[PDB]
Amino acid sequence: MEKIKVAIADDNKELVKTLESYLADHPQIEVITTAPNGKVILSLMENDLPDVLLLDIIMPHLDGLAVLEMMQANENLSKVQVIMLTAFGQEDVMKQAVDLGASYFMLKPFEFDRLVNQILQVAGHK
């Protein structure tokens, strides 16, 4: 049973806690790191790349679109499927996510299993 490697970057620690637990329990998903802001995920993104990055747009110090733009310029996005997560679903923002190479965009709140199903779409095979 092959595991899709997932990383999470979000500044709501209770969501990161819950979501890491839920995704790990899935047979085809392995959560390999979590970060609470944009700087920390970039530190981690050096050296260690997931198949899927769950990425909150609104974050202290360094936000989701900044991370996405840095990762697109470092050729990370060829491997990494980035799924933007946010309650700020403004139409120009999405457009930026698209230009900066996001695979997907999801609104908070979301059903966990519906997010699982999108992880399997962007990174699952057979």
Binding site for Mg ion (CB under 5 A): 56, 58
Instruction: Provide, rounded to whole angstroms, the least separation between the CB of residue 122 and Mg ion.
Output: 21
To Mg ion, the closest distance from the beta carbon of 105 in angstroms equals: 14
Pick the closer one to Mg ion by CB: 56 or 123: 56
**DSSP codes, 56-84:** ESS-SSS-HHHHHHHHHHTT-TTTPEEEE
Nearer to Mg ion, 3 or 39 (CB): 39
Q: In sequence order, which residues have a C-beta less than 8 Å from that of residue 109 and are 6 or more positions away?
A: 87
Residue nearest to Mg ion (CB): 58
Residues 6+ apart with CB under 8 A from 125: none
Q: Which lies closer to Mg ion via its Cβ, residue 82 or residue 123?
A: 82
3-state SS, residue 7? strand
Minimum CB distance to Mg ion smaller for 44 or for 58: 58
Phi and psi torsions of 6, nearest 5°: -115, 135
Q: Residue 110 CB, nearest distance to Mg ion (Å)? A: 13
- In whole angstroms, the minimum distance from the beta carbon of 67 to Mg ion comes to 13
